[PDB]
Coordinates of C-alpha atoms in Angstrom, one line a residue:
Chain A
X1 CA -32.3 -70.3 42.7
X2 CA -34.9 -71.6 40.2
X3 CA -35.9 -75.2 38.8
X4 CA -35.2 -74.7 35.5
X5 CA -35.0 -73.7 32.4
X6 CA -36.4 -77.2 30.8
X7 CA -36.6 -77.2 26.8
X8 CA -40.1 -77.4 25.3
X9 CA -42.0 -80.7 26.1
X10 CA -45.5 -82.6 26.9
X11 CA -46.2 -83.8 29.9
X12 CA -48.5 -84.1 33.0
X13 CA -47.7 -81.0 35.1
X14 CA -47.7 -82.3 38.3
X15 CA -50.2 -79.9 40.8
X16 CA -49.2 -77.2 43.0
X17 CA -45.9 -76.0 40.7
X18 CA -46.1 -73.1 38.8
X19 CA -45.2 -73.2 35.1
X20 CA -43.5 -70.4 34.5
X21 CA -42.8 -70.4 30.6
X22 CA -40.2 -67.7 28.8
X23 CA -40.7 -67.1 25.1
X24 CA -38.5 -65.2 22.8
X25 CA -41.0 -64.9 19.5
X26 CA -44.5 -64.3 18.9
X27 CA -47.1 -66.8 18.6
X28 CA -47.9 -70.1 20.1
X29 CA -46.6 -70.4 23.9
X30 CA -47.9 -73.4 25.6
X31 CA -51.2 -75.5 25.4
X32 CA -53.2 -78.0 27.8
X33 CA -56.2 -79.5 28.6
X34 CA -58.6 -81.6 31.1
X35 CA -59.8 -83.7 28.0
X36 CA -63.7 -82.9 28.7
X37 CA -64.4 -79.3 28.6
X38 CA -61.1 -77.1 29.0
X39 CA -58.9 -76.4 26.4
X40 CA -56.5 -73.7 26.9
X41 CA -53.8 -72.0 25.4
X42 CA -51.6 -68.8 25.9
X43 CA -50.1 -66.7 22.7
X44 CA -47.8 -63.9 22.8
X45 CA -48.3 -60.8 21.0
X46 CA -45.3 -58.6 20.5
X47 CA -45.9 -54.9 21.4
X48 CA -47.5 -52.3 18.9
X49 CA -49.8 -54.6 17.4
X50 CA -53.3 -53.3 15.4
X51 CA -56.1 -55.3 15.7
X52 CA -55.3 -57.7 13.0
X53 CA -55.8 -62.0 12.2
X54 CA -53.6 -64.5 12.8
X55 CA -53.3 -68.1 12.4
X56 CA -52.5 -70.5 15.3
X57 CA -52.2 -73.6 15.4
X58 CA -54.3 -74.8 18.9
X59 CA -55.4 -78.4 19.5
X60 CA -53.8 -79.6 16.3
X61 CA -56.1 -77.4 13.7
X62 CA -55.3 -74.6 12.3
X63 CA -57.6 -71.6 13.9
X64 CA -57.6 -67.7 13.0
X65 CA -57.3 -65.5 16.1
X66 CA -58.0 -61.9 16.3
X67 CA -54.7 -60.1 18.3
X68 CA -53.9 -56.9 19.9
X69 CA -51.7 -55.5 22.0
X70 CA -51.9 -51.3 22.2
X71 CA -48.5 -51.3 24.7
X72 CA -45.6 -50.0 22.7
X73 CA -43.0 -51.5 25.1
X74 CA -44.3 -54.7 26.7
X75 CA -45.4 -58.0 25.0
X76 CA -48.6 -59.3 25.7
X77 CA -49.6 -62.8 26.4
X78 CA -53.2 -63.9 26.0
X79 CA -55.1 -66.9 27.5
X80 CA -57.9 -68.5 25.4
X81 CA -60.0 -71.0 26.1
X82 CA -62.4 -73.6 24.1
X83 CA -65.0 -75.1 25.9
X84 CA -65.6 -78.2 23.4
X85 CA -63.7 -80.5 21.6
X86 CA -64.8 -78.8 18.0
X87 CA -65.3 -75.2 19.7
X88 CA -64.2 -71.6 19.4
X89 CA -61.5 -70.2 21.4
X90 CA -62.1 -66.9 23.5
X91 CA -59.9 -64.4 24.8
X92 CA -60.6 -64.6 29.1
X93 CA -57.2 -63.0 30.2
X94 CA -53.9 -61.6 29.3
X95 CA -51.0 -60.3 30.5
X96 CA -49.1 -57.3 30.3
X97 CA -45.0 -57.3 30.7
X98 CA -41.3 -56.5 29.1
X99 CA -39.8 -59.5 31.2
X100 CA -41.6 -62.3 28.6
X101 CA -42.5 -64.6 31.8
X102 CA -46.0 -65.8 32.4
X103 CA -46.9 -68.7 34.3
X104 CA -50.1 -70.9 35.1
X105 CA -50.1 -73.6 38.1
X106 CA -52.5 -76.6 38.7
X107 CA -53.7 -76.0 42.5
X108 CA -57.3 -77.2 43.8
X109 CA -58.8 -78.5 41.0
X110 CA -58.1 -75.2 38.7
X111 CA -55.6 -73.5 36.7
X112 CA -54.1 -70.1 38.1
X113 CA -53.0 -67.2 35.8
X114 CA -50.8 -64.1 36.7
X115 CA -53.3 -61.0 35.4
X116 CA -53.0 -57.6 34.6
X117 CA -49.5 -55.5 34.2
X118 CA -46.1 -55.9 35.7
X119 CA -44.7 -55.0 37.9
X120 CA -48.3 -55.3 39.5
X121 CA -49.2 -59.4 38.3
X122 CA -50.4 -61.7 40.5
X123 CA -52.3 -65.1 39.8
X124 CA -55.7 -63.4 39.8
X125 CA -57.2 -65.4 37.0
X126 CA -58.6 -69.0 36.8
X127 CA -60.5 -71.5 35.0
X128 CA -61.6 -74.5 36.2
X129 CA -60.1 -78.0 35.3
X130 CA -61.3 -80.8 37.7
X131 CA -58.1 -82.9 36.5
X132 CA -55.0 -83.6 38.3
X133 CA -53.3 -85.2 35.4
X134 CA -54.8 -82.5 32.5
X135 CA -51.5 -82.2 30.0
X136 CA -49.5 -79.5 29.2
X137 CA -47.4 -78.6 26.2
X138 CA -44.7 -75.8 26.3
X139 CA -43.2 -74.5 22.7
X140 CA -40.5 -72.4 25.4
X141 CA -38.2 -73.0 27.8
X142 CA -40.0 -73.0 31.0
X143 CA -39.3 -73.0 35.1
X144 CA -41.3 -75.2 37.9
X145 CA -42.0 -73.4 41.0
X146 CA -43.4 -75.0 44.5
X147 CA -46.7 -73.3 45.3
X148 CA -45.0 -72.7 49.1
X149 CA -42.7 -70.3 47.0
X150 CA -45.9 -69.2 44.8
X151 CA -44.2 -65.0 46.1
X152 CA -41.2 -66.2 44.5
X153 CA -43.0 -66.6 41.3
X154 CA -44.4 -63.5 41.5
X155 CA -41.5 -61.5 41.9
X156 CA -40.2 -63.1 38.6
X157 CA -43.2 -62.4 37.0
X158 CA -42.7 -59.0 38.1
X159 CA -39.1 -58.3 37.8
X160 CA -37.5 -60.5 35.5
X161 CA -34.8 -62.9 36.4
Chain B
X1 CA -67.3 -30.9 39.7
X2 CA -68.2 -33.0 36.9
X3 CA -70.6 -31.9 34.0
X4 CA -73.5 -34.3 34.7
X5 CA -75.1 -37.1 35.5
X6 CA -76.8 -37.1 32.1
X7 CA -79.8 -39.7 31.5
X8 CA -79.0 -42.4 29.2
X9 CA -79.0 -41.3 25.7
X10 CA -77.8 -41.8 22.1
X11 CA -75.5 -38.4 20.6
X12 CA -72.5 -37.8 18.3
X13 CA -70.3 -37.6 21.6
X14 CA -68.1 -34.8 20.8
X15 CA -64.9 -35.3 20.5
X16 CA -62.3 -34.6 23.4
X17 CA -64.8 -35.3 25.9
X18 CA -64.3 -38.6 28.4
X19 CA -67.8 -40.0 28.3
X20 CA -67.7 -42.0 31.7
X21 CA -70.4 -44.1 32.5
X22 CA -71.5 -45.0 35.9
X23 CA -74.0 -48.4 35.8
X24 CA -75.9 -49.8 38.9
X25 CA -76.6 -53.7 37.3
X26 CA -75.2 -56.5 35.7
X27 CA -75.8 -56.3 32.1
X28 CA -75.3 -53.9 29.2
X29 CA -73.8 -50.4 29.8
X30 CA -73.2 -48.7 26.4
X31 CA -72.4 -49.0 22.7
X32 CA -71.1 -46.7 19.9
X33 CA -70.0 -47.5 16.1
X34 CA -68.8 -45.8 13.7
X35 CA -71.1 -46.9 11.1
X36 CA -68.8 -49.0 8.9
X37 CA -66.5 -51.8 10.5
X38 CA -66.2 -50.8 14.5
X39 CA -69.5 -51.6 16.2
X40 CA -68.3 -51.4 20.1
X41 CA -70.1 -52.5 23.4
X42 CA -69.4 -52.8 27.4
X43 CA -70.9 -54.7 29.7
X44 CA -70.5 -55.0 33.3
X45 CA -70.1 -58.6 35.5
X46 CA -71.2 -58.5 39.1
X47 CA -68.2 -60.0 41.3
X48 CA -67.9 -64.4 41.6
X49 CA -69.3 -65.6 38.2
X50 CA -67.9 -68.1 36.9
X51 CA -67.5 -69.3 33.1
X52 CA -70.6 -68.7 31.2
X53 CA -73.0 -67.5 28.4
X54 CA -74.5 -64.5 28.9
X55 CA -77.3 -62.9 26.2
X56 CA -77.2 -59.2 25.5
X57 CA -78.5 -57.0 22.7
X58 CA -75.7 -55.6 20.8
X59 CA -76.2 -54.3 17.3
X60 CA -79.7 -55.0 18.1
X61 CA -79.3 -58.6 18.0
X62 CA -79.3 -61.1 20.9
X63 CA -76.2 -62.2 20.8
X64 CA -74.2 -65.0 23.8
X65 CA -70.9 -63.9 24.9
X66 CA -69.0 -65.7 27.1
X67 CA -68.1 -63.9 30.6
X68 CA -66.5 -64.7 34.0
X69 CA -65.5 -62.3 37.3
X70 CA -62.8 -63.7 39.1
X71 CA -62.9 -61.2 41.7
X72 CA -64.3 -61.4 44.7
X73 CA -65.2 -57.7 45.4
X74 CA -64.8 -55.8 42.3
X75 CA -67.3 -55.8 38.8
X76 CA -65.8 -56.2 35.6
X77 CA -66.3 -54.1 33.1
X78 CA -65.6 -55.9 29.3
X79 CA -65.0 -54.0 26.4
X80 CA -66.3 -56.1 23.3
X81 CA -65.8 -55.8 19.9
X82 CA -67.1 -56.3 16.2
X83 CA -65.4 -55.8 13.0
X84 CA -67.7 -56.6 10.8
X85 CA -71.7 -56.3 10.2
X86 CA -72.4 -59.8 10.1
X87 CA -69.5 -61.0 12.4
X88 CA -69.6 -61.2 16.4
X89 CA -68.3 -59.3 19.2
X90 CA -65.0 -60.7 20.6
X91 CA -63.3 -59.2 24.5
X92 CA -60.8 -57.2 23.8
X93 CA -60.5 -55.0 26.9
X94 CA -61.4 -55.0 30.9
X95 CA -61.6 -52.7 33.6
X96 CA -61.6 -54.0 37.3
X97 CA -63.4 -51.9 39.8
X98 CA -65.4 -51.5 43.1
X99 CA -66.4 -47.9 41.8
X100 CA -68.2 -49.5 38.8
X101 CA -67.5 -46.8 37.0
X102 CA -65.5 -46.6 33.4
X103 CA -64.7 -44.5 30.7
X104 CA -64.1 -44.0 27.1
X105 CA -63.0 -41.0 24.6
X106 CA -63.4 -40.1 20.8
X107 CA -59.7 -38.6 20.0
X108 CA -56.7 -38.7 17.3
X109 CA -59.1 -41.1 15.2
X110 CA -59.7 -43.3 18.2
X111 CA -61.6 -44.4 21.0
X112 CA -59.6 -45.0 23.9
X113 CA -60.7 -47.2 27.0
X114 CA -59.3 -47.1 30.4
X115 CA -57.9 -50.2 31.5
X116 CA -56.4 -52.3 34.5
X117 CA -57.4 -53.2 37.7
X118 CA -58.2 -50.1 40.2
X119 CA -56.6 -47.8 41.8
X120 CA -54.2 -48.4 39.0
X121 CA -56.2 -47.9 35.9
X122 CA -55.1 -46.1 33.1
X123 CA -56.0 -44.7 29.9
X124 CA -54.1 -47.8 27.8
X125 CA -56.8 -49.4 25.5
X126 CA -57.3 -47.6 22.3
X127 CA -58.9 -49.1 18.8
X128 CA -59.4 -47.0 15.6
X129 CA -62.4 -46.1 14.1
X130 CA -61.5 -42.9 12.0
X131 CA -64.8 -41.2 12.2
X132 CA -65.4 -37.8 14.9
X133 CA -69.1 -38.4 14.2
X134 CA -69.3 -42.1 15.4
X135 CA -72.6 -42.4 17.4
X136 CA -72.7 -43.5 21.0
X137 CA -75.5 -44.8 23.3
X138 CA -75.6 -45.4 27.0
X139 CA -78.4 -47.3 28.6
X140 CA -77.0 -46.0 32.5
X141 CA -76.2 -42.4 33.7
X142 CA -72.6 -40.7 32.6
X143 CA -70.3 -37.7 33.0
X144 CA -68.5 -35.9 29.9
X145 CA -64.6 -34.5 31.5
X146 CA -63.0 -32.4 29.0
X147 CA -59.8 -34.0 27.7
X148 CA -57.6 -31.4 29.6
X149 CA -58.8 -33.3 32.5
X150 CA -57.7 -36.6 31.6
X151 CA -56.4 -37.1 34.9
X152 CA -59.3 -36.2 36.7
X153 CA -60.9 -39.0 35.1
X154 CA -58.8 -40.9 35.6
X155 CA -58.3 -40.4 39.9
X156 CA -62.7 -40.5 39.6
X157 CA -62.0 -44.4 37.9
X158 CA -59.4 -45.7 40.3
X159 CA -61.0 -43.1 43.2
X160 CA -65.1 -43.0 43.0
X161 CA -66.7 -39.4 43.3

């Protein structure tokens, strides 16, 4: 049984609970930052997508992203990251799935990521954050999982609801 | 048996042929283009980097692009992209292996890339470029695998020799 779903919000996701955010359209997923020198953001891309531009609104402005996703089947989401306040975003991971879950988690001073393609995810990425009380911003309905049940997660990552 | 190791050269790669490349340091493996809007590049990251500017020569310019390895025990090879002469090279692709060894082909108007995390890496990545005399050039040894022996590329990429 899973905590959740709560409607799209702002707040300070407390540490060691996975985020576990389920889109139904493409674009703009969720947001959040350490307020120094992390700003990150996940989009979705739905499947069979040429290399084309896109406008996003991250951080407040208005920036044009360059998308892909060569799976005809699965949706891809894809984290960027600025590294200043003013700076470009940069594609550093993605992830591959028809189940439209992805999920990030503040644990030891970093963010966590599920990688790769289902049913073979698993919170292989990071960045580091050095802020307990970095904000986060969900445009989705979303799900809080303990780190303890961090397997859990990855089974719905994997396998749907 | 696999036709090669050829020395690091610069050819019209024909097409149908897997042109897999097997690099020994971090740094820059190979690049192609075909001559009008597709200039591509990979590199290869040594395992445990963290986020940071690296320089490489791409297009020959010296250009910073901004890597990380989150693995512990595999490289990472990164697939990098330009789409215009005076534009910069963007990720848009990965490999994750301990055989440090990757792959790409000239077919149906394409380049395709294999992708994933090893032993599970596949022939998914593709972007057009609409030109069977696009010109490649590898700075590290390679193998050609005719394109009736996809698979056999593919088990060498998830497999080693």
């Amino acid at each position: 049984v899973l905590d959740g779903p709560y409607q799209p919000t702002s707040f300070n996701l407390p540490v060691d609970y996975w985020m576990m955010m389920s889109p139904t359209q493409a674009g703009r997923v969720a947001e959040g930052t350490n307020g120094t020198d992390r700003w990150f953001a996940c989009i979705i891309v739905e499947p069979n997508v040429s290399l084309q531009s896109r406008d996003y609104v991250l951080d407040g402005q208005t920036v044009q992203l360059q998308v892909d996703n060569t799976s005809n089947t699965m949706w891809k989401f894809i984290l960027f990251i600025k590294l200043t306040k003013s700076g470009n975003y940069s594609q550093y991971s993605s992830l591959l799935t028809n189940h439209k879950l992805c999920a990030w988690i503040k644990r030891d001073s970093r963010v966590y990521w599920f990688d790769g393609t289902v049913p073979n995810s698993s919170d292989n990425y990071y960045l580091t954050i050095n802020n307990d009380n970095s904000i986060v911003s969900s445009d989705v309905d979303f799900y809080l999982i303990p780190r303890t049940q961090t397997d859990s997660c990855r089974r719905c990552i994997n396998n749907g609801l």
